[PDB]
C-alpha cells in the first residue's frame, strides 16, 4: 500500500464520483468481491486488444449501403480531398479499397495515416473506404470528405497502470421481524403500519407473509416469526427477500438476496436501512439506503443454521400445436393464463425449437420448484436452435428485463449479444447499461459484456463512462454497483483516456457551479438583468484564466475537441430555467472552418429522460436504414451529468417555431400560417437552396411525427419544436380537454403549399413518407415494445404501470394488418388538420398565460 497506489484510487474515485472502496453501506462483501472478480475479465481484454487499432478507434460498419446513399455514388467511385500544409489534392478513388490502397496510390500521384480534418477520427485498418461511417455521413450530407494526413498516435499513451450441507433442507423458510426504527414520523400522525415479507423472483412473488397492524410510532416492535410456504431447497439463485412496510399504501422497502454470491443461504442478524416511496427498477435493488440517520431501518432475524449451500447443476395433436403458436405469436405485452403456461411447459422441447418463444416459455417456468428448474437447465444444456439462430436484439432484450432473474436464462441472451459489432453496441448501449439494473448480482454476464466492449473500443468506452457516471451521480439505488463497473473500466482504458476524462470532469464541475450560481440571480422572473449578463461573462473569465482546462473532448461527440471559450458569444438563455449558452473554439487547427462548438448546460430538467428518447430516436433512424429510408431526424447530443443537470448540443442555424411566430406576429396566440415559409425564404435567397430546404422539412417533419407518435409524446407546445435555416425540423426538451396525435400545424402545411384542407404536391410527398416510415417501424413492433417498456422502468422516477406500457402497443396497432394500419396513421394525420391551431393556442394559454 504505497502512496502511489493510494493516489491512484483517490483519482479514480473522483473520476467515478463515488468512493468505490467505501464499505460503510454494505451488510456483506459482494461489492468487494465483484471489484476483485472483474480484475481478470479486464486483463484478458487489455492484453488481447491490438494497440494501434485501439489507439485510433476506427469507426466502421459491415452493413450494406442504403438505397438513399447508393444513388449518391456515380458508379463506384468517390472523391477525397487530402490536406498536408495548405496543399490540397482531390482524388477519385476506388470505393472498395482499403485506406491502404489510398495513400500508396496517393504517394504515386503527388509511416502516416488519414484523419478527418478537425476531428480525432482515423480511417485505417483493412476496411473498404465506403464502410467508414464518416464517409457515409458525408455522402448523405453531400459534403466533401476532407482528410488531413498526420502521424499515427503512439499506443504508449494508452499505457495501462501496473496491476457444508446441500439442497436438502426440507424445512420451510422463515424470518423474524423484530421491529422497525425511524427517528422521525409523518406530520399527518395517527397512522397504522405493518411489515410485509415477500419471496420474490423476476418481479413475481412466490410466497408472502405479513404482521399485525399497529400505530405508526418512532419504534414499532413485533419480534414475530413469519413462516413461508416454500421449502429452503426450493429457493432459486437470485431470489429476493423483499421487505416492505404499508401505512394505513406502500411506504418503505428494502431487499436481501437469499442466496449470496458464494451460493450460501443468507443468515444472521440484519439491520437494513430502507428506501422510501414518493413498479419500476429501483424497487429491485439489493442496495441499502446510505443515509442511516434519516432512513427507516428494519431489524430482522434469519434462521441460524450451519451452512446450507446451493449446488451448481451438472410431434403433437395439430389442434394443439395450433393453439401453442397462437401464444408464441403474441406480442411481449400480452399476458399468459395458467392454461397458456402449463401448455407452454408441457411442450418444452417443442416450444424450444422456436427462438421467439423463449421469453414466453421461460415465464411459464415455476422457479419456486427446484425440480422444475433443473429440468429447465437440462432443457438449455442443448441450445442448438438458439445458438444457430440469427441475432434478434428485440428478443434478446426481453430476456434481460425484469421478468428473468435466472443466471442461465440471462446468459444466453448475453451470449447472442457477443455477436454485435461495435457500431450496433453503440446503438443499444444506454439501454444495455440500464438493463444492468435488473441483474440480481453485481457480477454478471451482462456486466462483463459492457466491460469487455468498453476496454475493446474507445468510442464504446467513452460512452460507457458517461452512461454509468450519469447513474452513479444521481442514483443511490445503483451507484455502488455502477461504481464498481466503472472503476474496473477505468483500470484498462489507458493513461490517455484517463487524462481526457479528467479534462472533461473538470470542465463539467466548474461549468455547472456557474450554471447554478447564475440560476440563483432570478428564480421567478424572465428578465436577463443587464447585470446578470455581465455577471456571467465575468465568472467565465475567472475560470478561463489558468483554471478551466484549455481544451477537452466534447462528451457527446468525442471526436471533437473544445478549445477556449468565446466569452462574447456566451449568454444566459431567456428561459424560465436560465440555461447557459456557451460557445467554444475547436482546438484543432486542421479544422476546415471557424465555426464554434456550442454547448448548453442546464438545471431543472431530468436529462436522463432526454437521453433515453434521443437514443430510441437514433435506433429508429437505424431501423429506417434497413428498410432503406432517411427521415432526417436530428437527435442532438445530450448527456445527463448529475441530478437535474447536464449538457446539451447546440444545433447550429436553428430556432424555435414559437419564436418565429413571435417576431412576425407577437406576444399572443393569433398565429399566422405564413410566417414559417416567409422565414425559410428570408434565410434561403437562392432558389435551389430554398427549394431543397423544403424537401428536408417534409421528411424531417414526417419522421418526428411518426417517431413522436409511436413514443406517445406527439402533443407538445411550439417552443419545444425547432427548425434549421436548411429546413430541418426537430423536437427538443423531452424532459377532460383537447389533444392531438402530433404537431402538424397550419404553418407547417403552409410550407408544403396547402393553405386550406386541399391536398398538395408536397403534402402527398409527406403523406407517403409518413405511412412508409410508420409501417417500417411496425416491422419492429416487438423491439420498440420492450425498449419502451425498459425505458419506463429505469428512466421514470415515478412508479410506472402496465397501463403505461400498453400505450405503445396501441400506437403500433399490434395484431392489425398493414392495410388497416396505413389508414390509422392517415386518420391521425387528419385530426391534425381538423384542429388547426387549436391545441397550440391552448398550450399558449396554459404554458404562457398560466391559465
Which x/- pattern, by CB under 6 A, does the window 685-724 give for ligand QUE? ----------------------------------------
* Nearer CB in complex with ligand QUE: 260/605: 605
Q: Residue 480 or 640: which CB sits closer to ligand QUE?
A: 640
Beta carbon nearer to ligand QUE, 514 or 629: 514
Q: Which stretch binds ligand QUE (CB under 6 A): 246-254, 300-308, 402-410, 727-735?
A: 727-735
Nearer to ligand QUE, 357 or 600 (CB): 600
CA distance 343 to 520: 62
Residue 601 near ligand QUE by CB under 6 A: no
* CA nearest to 825, candidates 835, 811, 836, 814: 811
Residue 193: what are its φ and ψ, rounded to 5°? -145, 155
The interface mask with ligand QUE, positions 631-650, x = CB under 6 A, is -----x-----------xxx
Helix (H, G, I), strand (E, B) or coil at 82: strand
Least distance (Å) from ligand QUE to the CB of residue 605? Answer: 6
Distance in Å, CB of 636 to ligand QUE, minimum: 4
Instruction: Kindly tell me which of 99 and 579 has the beta carbon lying closer to ligand QUE.
Output: 579
Q: Taking CB under 6 A as the criterion, which residues in 653-672 touch ligand QUE?
A: 654-656
**Judged by CB under 6 A, which of 528, 651, 775, 847 binds ligand QUE?**
651
DSSP E strand boundaries for 293-367? 297-302
Compute the least distance from the CB of residue 517 to ligand QUE, in Å: 19
**Closest approach of Cβ 598 to ligand QUE, in Å?**
7
Cell of 189: 400522525
Give every strand in the sheet of 268-273, ordered side by side: 219-231, 172-181, 297-302, 268-273
Query: Quick check: 259 and 239 in contact, CB under 8 A?
Result: yes
The 10 Å CB-count burial string (b at 16+, else e) for 573-605 is: eeeebbbbbbbbbbbbebbeeeebbbbbbbbbb
Residue number with CB closer to ligand QUE (254 or 648):
648
Among 28, 422, 605, 747, binds ligand QUE (CB under 6 A): 605
Q: Which ranges in 553-656 belong to alpha helices (H)?
A: 607-626
Helix, strand or coil for residue 515?
A: helix
- The widest CA-to-CA distance across the chain, in whole angstroms, is 89
DSSP label at residue 573 = -
Quote the least distance from Cβ 599 to ligand QUE, whole Å: 10
732 binds ligand QUE (CB under 6 A): yes
Closest separation in Å from C-beta 574 to ligand QUE: 9
**Least separation in angstroms between CB 696 and ligand QUE:** 16
Q: With CB under 6 A, what is the number of residues at the site for ligand QUE?
A: 13
Nearer to ligand QUE, 425 or 647 (CB): 647
Asked if 584 is part of the footprint of ligand QUE (rule: CB under 6 A), the reply reads no
Tell the smallest beta-carbon distance from residue 723 to ligand QUE (Å): 10
DSSP structural state of residue 418: T
| CA-based radius of gyration for the chain | 29
Residues 201-230 close enough to bind ligand QUE by CB under 6 A: none
**CB nearer to ligand QUE: pick between 233 and 717:** 717
> Which one of residues 234, 282, 487, 733 is an interface residue with ligand QUE (CB under 6 A)?
733
* Least distance between ligand QUE and beta carbon 717 (Å): 12
Q: Does 250 bind ligand QUE (CB under 6 A)?
A: no
DSSP-based three-state secondary structure for 275: strand
Per the annotation, binding residues are: 598-607, 633-641, 730-735
Q: Are 750 and 766 in contact (CB under 8 A)?
A: no
User: How would you write 280-305 as a 3-class SS string?
Assistant: CHHHHCCCCCCCCCCCCEEEEEECCC
CB closer to ligand QUE, 365 vs 721: 721
Rounded distance between C-alpha atoms, residue 203 and residue 367, angstroms: 12
Provide the annotated binding site for ATP.
598-607, 633-641, 730-735
**Residues 709/828, Cβ–Cβ less than 8 Å:** yes
User: Segment near ligand QUE (CB under 6 A), from 171-179, 324-332, 526-534, 651-659?
Assistant: 651-659
Residue 735 engages ligand QUE in binding (rule: CB under 6 A): yes
**123 class by beta-carbon count within 10 Å (0-12 exposed, 13-18 middle, 19+ buried):** buried
Query: Is residue 729 within 8 Å of residue 723, measured between CB atoms?
Result: yes
What are the C-alpha distances in Å from 661 to residues 151, 427, 545, 731? 51, 36, 41, 17
Residue ranges in contact with ligand QUE by CB under 6 A: 605, 610, 636, 648-651, 654-656, 732-733, 735
Amino acid at each position: 500500500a504505497s502512496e502511489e497506489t493510494l493516489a491512484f484510487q483517490r483519482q479514480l474515485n473522483a473520476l467515478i464520483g463515488y468512493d468505490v472502496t467505501d464499505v460503510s453501506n454494505v451488510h456483506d462483501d459482494e461489492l468487494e468481491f465483484t471489484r476483485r472478480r472483474l480484475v481478470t475479465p479486464r486483463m484478458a481484454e487489455v492484453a488481447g486488444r491490438d494497440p494501434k487499432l485501439y489507439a485510433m478507434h476506427p469507426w466502421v460498419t459491415s452493413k450494406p449501403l442504403p438505397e438513399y446513399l447508393l444513388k449518391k455514388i456515380t458508379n463506384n467511385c468517390v472523391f477525397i480531398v487530402i490536406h498536408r500544409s495548405t496543399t490540397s489534392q482531390t482524388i477519385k478513388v476506388s470505393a472498395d479499397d482499403t485506406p491502404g490502397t489510398i495513400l500508396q496510390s496517393f504517394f504515386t500521384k503527388m509511416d502516416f495515416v488519414l484523419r478527418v480534418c478537425g476531428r480525432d477520427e482515423y480511417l485505417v485498418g483493412e476496411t473498404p473506404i465506403k464502410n467508414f461511417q464518416w464517409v457515409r455521413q458525408c455522402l448523405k450530407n453531400g459534403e466533401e470528405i476532407h482528410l488531413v494526413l498526420d502521424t499515427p498516435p503512439d499506443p504508449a499513451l494508452d499505457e495501462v497502470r501496473k496491476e457444508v450441507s446441500l439442497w436438502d433442507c426440507d424445512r420451510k423458510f422463515r424470518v423474524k421481524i423484530r421491529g422497525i426504527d425511524i427517528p422521525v414520523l409523518p406530520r399527518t400522525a395517527d397512522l397504522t403500519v405493518f411489515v410485509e415479507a415477500n419471496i420474490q423472483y423476476g418481479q413475481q412473488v412466490l410466497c408472502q407473509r405479513r404482521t399485525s397492524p399497529k400505530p405508526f410510532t418512532e419504534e414499532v416492535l413485533w419480534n414475530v416469526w413469519l413462516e413461508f410456504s416454500i421449502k429452503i431447497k426450493d429457493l432459486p439463485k437470485g431470489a429476493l427477500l423483499n421487505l416492505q412496510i404499508y401505512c394505513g399504501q406502500l411506504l418503505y422497502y428494502v431487499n436481501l438476496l437469499l442466496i449470496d454470491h458464494r451460493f450460501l443461504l443468507r443468515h444472521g442478524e440484519y439491520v437494513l436501512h430502507m428506501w422510501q416511496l414518493s413498479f419500476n427498477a429501483d424497487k429491485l435493488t439489493s442496495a441499502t439506503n446510505p443515509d442511516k440517520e434519516n432512513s427507516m431501518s428494519i431489524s430482522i432475524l434469519l434462521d441460524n443454521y450451519c451452512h446450507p449451500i446451493a449446488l451448481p447443476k451438472h410431434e403433437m395433436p395439430n389442434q394443439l400445436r395450433k393453439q401453442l403458436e397462437a401464444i408464441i405469436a403474441t406480442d411481449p405485452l400480452n399476458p399468459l393464463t395458467a392454461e397458456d403456461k402449463e401448455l407452454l411447459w408441457h411442450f418444452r422441447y417443442e416450444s424450444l425449437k422456436d427462438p421467439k418463444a423463449y421469453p414466453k416459455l421461460f415465464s411459464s417456468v415455476k422457479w419456486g420448484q427446484q425440480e422444475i428448474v433443473a429440468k429447465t437447465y437440462q432443457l438449455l444444456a442443448k441450445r442448438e436452435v438458439w445458438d444457430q439462430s440469427a441475432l434478434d436484439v428485440g428478443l434478446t432484450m426481453q430476456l434481460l428485463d425484469c421478468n428473468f432473474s435466472d443466471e442461465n436464462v440471462r446468459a444466453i441472451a448475453v451470449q447472442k449479444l457477443e455477436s454485435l459489432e461495435d457500431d450496433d453496441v453503440l446503438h443499444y448501449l444506454l439501454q444495455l447499461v440500464q438493463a444492468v439494473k435488473f441483474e440480481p448480482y453485481h457480477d454478471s454476464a451482462l456486466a462483463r459484456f459492457l466491460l469487455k466492449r468498453g476496454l475493446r473500443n474507445k468510442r464504446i468506452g467513452h460512452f460507457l463512462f458517461w452512461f454509468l457516471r450519469s447513474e452513479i451521480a444521481q442514483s443511490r439505488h445503483y451507484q455502488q454497483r455502477f461504481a464498481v463497473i466503472l472503476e474496473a473500466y477505468l483500470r484498462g482504458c489507458g493513461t490517455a483516456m484517463l487524462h481526457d476524462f479528467t479534462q472533461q470532469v473538470q470542465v463539467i464541475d466548474m461549468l455547472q457551479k456557474v450554471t447554478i450560481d447564475i440560476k440563483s440571480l432570478s428564480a421567478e422572473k424572465y428578465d436577463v438583468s443587464s447585470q446578470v449578463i455581465s455577471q456571467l461573462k465575468q465568472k467565465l473569465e475567472n475560470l478561463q484564466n489558468l483554471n478551466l482546462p484549455q481544451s477537452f473532448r466534447v462528451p457527446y461527440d468525442p471526436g471533437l475537441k473544445a478549445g477556449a471559450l468565446v466569452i462574447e458569444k456566451c449568454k444566459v438563455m431567456a428561459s424560465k430555467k436560465k440555461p447557459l449558452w456557451l460557445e467554444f473554439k475547436c482546438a484543432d487547427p486542421t479544422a476546415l472552418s471557424n465555426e464554434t462548438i456550442g454547448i448548453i448546460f442546464k438545471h431543472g430538467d431530468d436529462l436522463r429522460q432526454d437521453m433515453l428518447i434521443l437514443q430510441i430516436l437514433r435506433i429508429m433512424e437505424s431501423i429506417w436504414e434497413t428498410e432503406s429510408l432517411d427521415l432526417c431526424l436530428l437527435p442532438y447530443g445530450c448527456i445527463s451529468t448529475g441530478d437535474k443537470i447536464g449538457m446539451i448540443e447546440i444545433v447550429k442555424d436553428a430556432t424555435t417555431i414559437a419564436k418565429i411566430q413571435q417576431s412576425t406576429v407577437g406576444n399572443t396566440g393569433a398565429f399566422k400560417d405564413e410566417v414559417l415559409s416567409h422565414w425559410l425564404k428570408e434565410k434561403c435567397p437562392i432558389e435551389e437552396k430554398f427549394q431543397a430546404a423544403v424537401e428536408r422539412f417534409v421528411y424531417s417533419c414526417a419522421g418526428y411525427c411518426v417517431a413522436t407518435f409511436v413514443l406517445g409524446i406527439g402533443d407538445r407546445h411550439n417552443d419545444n419544436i425547432m427548425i434549421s435555416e436548411t429546413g430541418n425540423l426537430f423536437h427538443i426538451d423531452f424532459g377532460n380537454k383537447e389533444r392531438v396525435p402530433f404537431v402538424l400545424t397550419p404553418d407547417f402545411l403552409f410550407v408544403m403549399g396547402t393553405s386550406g384542407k386541399k391536398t398538395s404536391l408536397h403534402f402527398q410527398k409527406f403523406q407517403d413518407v409518413c405511412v412508409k416510415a410508420y409501417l417500417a417501424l411496425r416491422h419492429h413492433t416487438n423491439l420498440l415494445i420492450i425498449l419502451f417498456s425498459m425505458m419506463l422502468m429505469t428512466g421514470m422516477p415515478q412508479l410506472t404501470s402496465k397501463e403505461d406500457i400498453e400505450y405503445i402497443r396501441d400506437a403500433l396497432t399490434v395484431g392489425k394488418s398493414e392495410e388497416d394500419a396505413k389508414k390509422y396513421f392517415l386518420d391521425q394525420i387528419e385530426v391534425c388538420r381538423d384542429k388547426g391551431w387549436t391545441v397550440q393556442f391552448n398550450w399558449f394559454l396554459h404554458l404562457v398565460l398560466g391559465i
